[PDB]
Structure 1
Amino acid sequence: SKGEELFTGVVPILVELDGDVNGHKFSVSGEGEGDATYGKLTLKFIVTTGKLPVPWPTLVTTFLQCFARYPDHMKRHDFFKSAMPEGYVQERTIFFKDDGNYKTRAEVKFEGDTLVNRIELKGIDFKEDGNILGHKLEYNYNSHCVYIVADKQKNGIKVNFKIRHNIEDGSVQLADHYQQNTPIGDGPVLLPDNHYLCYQSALSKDPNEKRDHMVLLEFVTAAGITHGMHELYKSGSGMVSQETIKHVKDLIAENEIFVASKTYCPYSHAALNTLFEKLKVPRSKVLVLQLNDMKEGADIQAALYEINGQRTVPNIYINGKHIGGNDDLQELRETGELEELLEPIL
């Protein structure tokens, strides 16, 4: 399958990392599973070479954003899954305030029914007495959202975020991240509009594990883009004769309630149900118009736009005053404005 289809269910994950921080070589292996529908991640890492020369917490970001949950209205912005199965390369440079930095490169891709994260990390200029080499960071992780931005030039995404690692003495170790993601193959990929990815992580130990390890649980969700559906409702694609313009105006002035609609339009359905059922308004007070059922439907609707700028049905009016669409009608229903507008009419 292609792109997101590959993440519909629970996916097995494998992670491999070879690192050398300040000359101290080490390598870790990790396994778990992802469930993008719930933005779930469950992994277990084990150090193969002995122990870790750095705190586990400082490796969390390095140790799978293709598993984040993207809401139904943000599928077009899921860059990570669109790169699969071929994958993408993730590069980062993490500057540790008043200390050394990590430079990382990783290739994420499917190898069979498995998503594999192969990483290479190098650390340099770290203080042997600092919080990193000195192992002074609490075994926890803070929650927060990061700002995701597309990099049209590189055909991928960019991210600059800061991680705060709690230090045992109540203070904090600053981890300034610089992330760059690039597609591996040359097939289509979805570049997103700026948005957010909110993380929540949980670190634990396997009481049955005797080698240095870490059990990570991450919950990730995409957020920040607006639900385009009701927006589209408002948006819509020779000028009309004044003859028609006045006529529509007359229709507006000569009627207590005016409603231009179409028989198949949901918003019209609801606007009408609101007036005739919910608010039990008399059919003799409401002049309805099924534009898709008239000779001059087009002309009328055209004339309407010319008169109020609205291009979509339902186009509602009350006592000569333009109201708008259904959302405008619901607007006034809640603020209680509608009830008072109808009082006189009723």
Structure 2
Amino acid sequence: SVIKPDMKIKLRMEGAVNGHPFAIEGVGLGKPFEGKQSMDLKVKEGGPLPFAYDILTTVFNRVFAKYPENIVDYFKQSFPEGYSWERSMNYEDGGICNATNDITLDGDCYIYEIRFDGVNFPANGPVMQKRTVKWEPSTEKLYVRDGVLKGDVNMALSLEGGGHYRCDFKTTYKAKKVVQLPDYHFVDHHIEIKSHDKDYSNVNLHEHAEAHSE
């Protein structure tokens, strides 16, 4: 297979939040079969970012998910051609983020082309006022719809000062070539920023994911 235990990551994100443009590029590595990955992100345009960095982290590849033998792996199946996904993230206070990622493979490195667009975040909200701490772990529900894979997850950001800020995710994954379709299943996720400088110009982001079924 084209999927090897150790692979590299390279990405560029171009986006905007409340109409203000920015761009971030990253370099990382991961273990597709263990569902582990790490990366170093750097703001190239639009910094210092005037919004909570956390609204970006889950946009920074389900190929990095431990898939058991009894569960069809939609993602690892799609390479070398690769796959792409679209997502809408609806926050409880009206803020909404749309994102897309086109994932291709070059040798042993995945290449991401990411677009990010968020709007309607309240000026006094947790995002614009950067009052988030981290995302809580989550469980994504994945199911097939019209020959493609859909995935929804109830997300929540812990807020500095107590409480949580809820956001609902709705994603569509599209393999660039025909692959076997899986049965309804789940993917546990745990994303964490391990380090970063004061204004988040540099960020070290890690993620751990594992799939499973009833």
TM-score normalized by the length of structure 1: 0.58
Map 1:311-326 to 2 at 5 A. none
Match for residue 205 of structure 1?
Answer: 195
Higher relative contact order (CA 8 A, sep 6+): 2
Equivalent pairs, count: 213
> Aligned partners of 2:166, 2:89: CA distance in 1, in Å?
10
Work out the percentage of aligned pairs sharing the same amino acid.
24
Greater per-residue strand proportion = 2
Q: What is the identity, as a one-letter code, of the residue corresponding to 1:124? A: V
> Aligned partners of 1:174, 1:141: CA distance in 2, in Å?
10
Runs of 4+ in 1 over 3 A off after TM superposition: none
Q: What is the identity, as a one-letter code, of the residue corresponding to 2:164? A: V
> Aligned partners of 2:123, 2:199: CA distance in 1, in Å?
26
Map 1:27-176 to 2 at 5 A. 27-49=23-45, 50-74=47-71, 77-138=72-133, 140-151=134-145, 153=146, 155-176=147-168
Match for residue 293 of structure 1?
Answer: none
Q: Contact (CA 8 Å) 1:26, 1:51: kept in 2 or not?
A: no
Q: Contact (CA 8 Å) 2:135, 2:157: kept in 1 or not?
A: yes
Query: Which blocks of at least 5 consecutive residues in structure 2 are unaligned?
Result: none
Shift of the alpha carbon at 1:7?
Answer: 2.2
Over the aligned positions, Cα root-mean-square deviation in angstroms equals: 1.8
> Aligned partners of 2:98, 2:191: CA distance in 1, in Å?
22
TM-score normalized by the length of structure 2: 0.92
Q: What is the identity, as a one-letter code, of the residue corresponding to 2:58? A: T
Q: Contact (CA 8 Å) 2:144, 2:183: kept in 1 or not?
A: yes
Map 1:196-345 to 2 at 5 A. 196-205=186-195, 212-224=201-213
Query: Which blocks of at least 5 consecutive residues in structure 1 are unaligned?
Result: 226-346
> Aligned partners of 1:221, 1:79: CA distance in 2, in Å?
14
Shift of the alpha carbon at 1:141?
Answer: 2.7
Shift of the alpha carbon at 1:157?
Answer: 0.6
> Aligned partners of 1:211, 1:147: CA distance in 2, in Å?
31
- Compare 65-74 and 25-34 and name the one that shifted more: 65-74
Bigger Rg over Cα: 1
Shift of the alpha carbon at 1:210?
Answer: 8.4
Q: Contact (CA 8 Å) 1:79, 1:156: kept in 2 or not?
A: no
Deviations 1:253-293 (A, max 9, x none): xxxxxxxxxxxxxxxxxxxxxxxxxxxxxxxxxxxxxxxxx
Q: Contact (CA 8 Å) 2:139, 2:153: kept in 1 or not?
A: no
> Aligned partners of 2:211, 2:108: CA distance in 1, in Å?
24
Deviations 1:36-71 (A, max 9, x none): 221111111111122223212111211111111112
**SS of residue paired to 1:205:** strand
